[PDB]
Amino acid sequence: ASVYAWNRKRISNCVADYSVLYNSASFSTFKCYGVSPTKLNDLCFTNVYA
Amino acid sequence: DSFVIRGDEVRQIAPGQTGKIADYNYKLPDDFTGCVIAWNSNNLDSKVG
Amino acid sequence: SALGKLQDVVNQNAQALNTLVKQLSSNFGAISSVLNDILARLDPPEAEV
Numbered sequence: 395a396s397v398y399a400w401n402r403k404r405i406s407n408c409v410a411d412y413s414v415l416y417n418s419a420s421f422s423t424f425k426c427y428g429v430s431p432t433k434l435n436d437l438c439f440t441n442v443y444a
Numbered sequence: 445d446s447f448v449i450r451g452d453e454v455r456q457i458a459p460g461q462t463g464k465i466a467d468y469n470y471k472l473p474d475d476f477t478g479c480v481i482a483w484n485s486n487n488l489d490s491k492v493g
Numbered sequence: 494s495a496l497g498k499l500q501d502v503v504n505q506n507a508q509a510l511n512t513l514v515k516q517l518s519s520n521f522g523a524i525s526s527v528l529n530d531i532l533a534r535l536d537p538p539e540a541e542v
C-alpha cells in the first residue's frame with residue numbers, strides 16, 4: 395500500500411522465528427528501537443501490528 | 445586494524461552498532477577509544493572482471 | 494488517641510518504607526521500571542543507558 399494508506403495487519407496466535415529476519419541480508423535497514431534484535435526469540439508479545 | 449568493507453557499511457564500524465560485519469566480522473567495544481579511518485579505494489581495490 | 498506518639502512513630506516508619514518500596518515502580522524516564530524486562534529486551538549498549 396501507499397504511505398498515506400499504509401496497511402496494518404494484526405499478528406496473533408502464532409510462534410514467530412525472528413532469527414530468519416536478522417540473518418537475512420535482503421534488508422537494507424533492520425533497526426529496532428524498544429527491543430534488541432537478538433532477544434526477539436526469547437520474548438512473548440501481543441498487540442503485534444505490521 | 446586494517447580491512448576493506450563496502451561503502452554503506454562504514455556506519456557499522458562504531459561502538460554499540462547493530463549490523464552484519466559488526467556482529468560476525470569486526471566488533472568494537474562499548475568503551476572503545478581511538479579513531480576509525482575510511483577512504484575510497486575504487487582505483488586500487490576493484491577490477492573490471 | 495491516648496497512645497498517639499508511639500502510633501505516630503510506627504506510622505511514619507511504615508509510611509516511609511512504603512514510599513521506598515513504591516519508588517521501585519517508577520521508571521524515572523526509562524522504558525520500564527523492571528530491570529529484568531530491560532535486561533531481557535535490550536542489548537548492553539542501550540540497556541546500560
